[PDB]
Write a protein that binds this ligand. Structure first.
Ligand SMILES: CC[n+]1c(-c2ccccc2)c2cc(N)ccc2c2ccc(N)cc21
Ligand SMILES: Nc1ccc2cc3ccc(N)cc3nc2c1
Lengths: 186, 186
């Protein structure tokens, strides 16, 4: 594909290097396509990137729907979502590239904008889990949005800043966390 | 001292031009030293930078040693310390050179090894709050080292991935989080 092989080499470059480490010269070299092509659906580098973020956030949110049935209760969905977070091939592997990118465009205006419709997909998962959990007496949480946001970020932290120690310790810690967290809501 | 003048000049350069832009040539000239002396004291830019980082951790440890006096109980030191990490990174100049550096040296083992004897120092603060909290029966944690690795990374997550919200909100969340986490140990 054309408008898609671009996004493909893109996602990869952004992961295998950094947000800046990969420049348009590169995309149009490994994806092969006149600089112009990169101008339709992608009105900028921050578009090509803020684009992939949406795909990714989606591919994951979907993989999660197709894997969350293994969780009978929400207290179980909480643990599961967090544990899966550690192993997907989606979204979470671009957290570094995002940190970077948000430190080099957070000045522009449309930065804190797209980072809204996207931030809502991101904390959705927890939102559903914590809300559906009040309807299920599992716990009682007045400020759901707060907690979703907290949990989403805490988790992303555990996932991102420990991506160096053996996968089994990572999942071990993440569970102790999910454990401590939920025990804090009741 | 010529060693110290190099660390000083280099810090400033990294802060103004960033990690990538600062060459060792500049560092050598502005500190009135030589490629040889620099090589002898640090070997590489990556090492130079990690040494700056080590020194920064220390000043931060010392700063904490004084600040915590404000916090009588460890429950308090926990809340406090999390708030400090939040607010202080907000206006921490090296922060950008740091991002730029980490997301560019987490594959290498040279930079992945020393980068961890460093992270360990950050984690120790929590280690202490937690160990000491046990002896005062504020809580009872049988796995202090783990709970520590968790707090450390859960917190950076909230610090690092909430940058799009206004400061009071961020601090509101961080305190809510400290509240929940501390509650799940009870
Ligand atoms: C896992 C290390 N680590 C920390 C870090 C985490 C806990 C304590 C000290 C530093 C980090 C902290 C901030 N603010 C921003 C980016 C990074 C980062 C980025 C990439 C990477 N590969 C490791 C990274
Ligand atoms: N990797 C590192 C090393 C040392 C650090 C020292 C700091 C001092 C104050 C502050 N607000 C953030 C800091 N972050 C650091 C991150």
């Amino acid at each position: 594909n054309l408008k898609d092989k671009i996004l493909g080499v893109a996602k990869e470059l952004f992961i295998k290097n950094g947000y800046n480490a990969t420049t348009t010269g590169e995309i149009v070299k490994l994806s092969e396509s006149s600089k112009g092509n990169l101008y339709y659906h992608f009105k900028t580098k921050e578009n090509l990137f803020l684009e992939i973020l949406n795909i990714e956030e989606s591919k994951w949110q979907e993989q999660w729907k197709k894997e969350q049935i293994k969780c009978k209760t929400n207290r179980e969905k909480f643990y599961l979502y967090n544990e899966l977070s550690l192993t997907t091939e989606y979204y979470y592997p671009l957290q570094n590239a995002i940190i970077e990118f948000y430190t080099e465009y957070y000045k522009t205006n449309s930065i804190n904008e797209k980072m809204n419709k996207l931030e809502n997909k991101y904390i959705d998962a927890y939102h559903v889990i914590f809300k559906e959990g009040n309807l299920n007496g599992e716990w009682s949480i007045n400020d759901v949005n707060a907690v979703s946001k907290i949990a989403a970020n805490a988790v992303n932290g555990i996932v991102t800043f420990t991506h160096e120690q053996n996968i089994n310790e990572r999942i071990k810690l993440m569970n102790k966390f999910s454990q401590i967290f939920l025990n804090g809501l009741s």
